[PDB]
Amino acid sequence: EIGTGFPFDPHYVEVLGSRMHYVDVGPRDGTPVLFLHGNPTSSYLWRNIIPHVAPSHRCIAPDLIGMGKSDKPDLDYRFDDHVRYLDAFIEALGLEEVVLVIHDWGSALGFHWAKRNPERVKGIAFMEFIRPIPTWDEWPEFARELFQAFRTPDVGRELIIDYNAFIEIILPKFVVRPLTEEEMDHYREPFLKPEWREPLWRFPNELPINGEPADIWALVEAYMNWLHQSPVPKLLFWGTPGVLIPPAEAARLAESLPNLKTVFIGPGLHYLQEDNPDLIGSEIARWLPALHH
Ligand SMILES: [Cl-]
């Protein structure tokens, strides 16, 4: 049965005047494996994946600023805020070379950092990641009205801020198997009060859809161009029907990206880690040794 516990001792680092929480397990040296969650999750999303990798490699899984057990500074929580704080977290941990394991907005952060640090990135494992969405017709129909509403003035803030839609609707909607109450309560803990929910609303308002917002669209196109030209080792996990990465997109990536291994995880929507953590973790562990020449 999929584990609901979070058996990781807390670690904190002060950056830019705020504390960020992170998981840090495994050996203390070697190339670390940096796990980056997205919306509306935290390092809790990686709880059943990390134990597959920790016997062989250091595993570092930060909570993005304003999320998980990290501090809640008074920010807009725009994408560039998350870039700045994750850059400061990576710096404070002294990371030189890394393997990235990334999802959702954690993948936009990770691919943007990799583009800027191409000689530091030794591998990227990614799943249900951020890519330019050409129009609303390439957003899944069953979640279209909701995400259009999230991006509608006033309505979206009411849904996400006042009524906590990203936690109470989207999270269970985007896992195939049923979440348990214990798992929901872990996810709910950082957002029990509405003044804590700004990151949750800003993220869907940053999604690059039909050119907008233009700055994120440009940034995501840039790192996808980098990815298509980079020889870095790559590992993609995909499910069916998927959400950001449907099977047709997984196939396009299998054809286009260099040095790519793909793993089909079975039924999956967006939070693939909650549907098949053990295959994701075991396959990451099996893929890592070849990154060490
Ligand atoms: Cl989002």
Numbering used by the authors: 3 to 295
Q: What did the paper state?
A:
The target protein used in this study is the computationally stabilized haloalkane dehalogenase DhaA115 designed previously using the web server FireProt. Eleven mutations that were originally introduced in the wild type increased its apparent melting temperature (Tmapp) to approx. 73 °C (ΔTmapp ∼ 23 °C), making it the most stable haloalkane dehalogenase to date. First, DhaA115 displays activity toward a broad range of halogenated substrates, many of which are toxic and carcinogenic compounds persistent in the environment, e.g., 1,2-dichloroethane and 1,2-dibromoethane.
Following the experimental validation of all FireProt designs, we removed the destabilizing mutations L161M, I163L from DhaA216 and obtained the most stable FireProt variant, DhaA223, with 6 °C higher Tmapp compared to DhaA115. We obtained diffraction-quality crystals of DhaA223 and DhaA231 enzymes that belonged to the space groups P1211 and P212121 and diffracted at 1.5 and 1.3 Å resolution, respectively. The positioning of catalytic pentad residues was not disturbed, which is a prerequisite for efficient catalysis. Here, we show that the protein backbones of DhaA223 and DhaA231 superpose well with that of the DhaA115, although some minor changes are observed in the hinge regions between the helical cap domain and the hydrolase core. The crystal structures of DhaA223 and DhaA231 thus suggest that stabilization was achieved via strengthening intricate networks of residue-to-residue interactions, stabilizing the αβα-sandwich architecture. A notable example includes residues 184 and 197, where mutation of hydrophobic valines to glutamic acids created local hydrogen-bond networks involving water molecules. Specifically, this translates to approx. 7-, 12-, and 5-times longer half-lives at 70 °C of DhaA222, 223, and 231, respectively, compared to the 8-minute half-life of DhaA115 at this temperature. The substrate inhibition of DhaA222 and DhaA231 is exergonic at the whole temperature range, in contrast to DhaA223, for which it becomes energetically unfavorable at high temperatures.
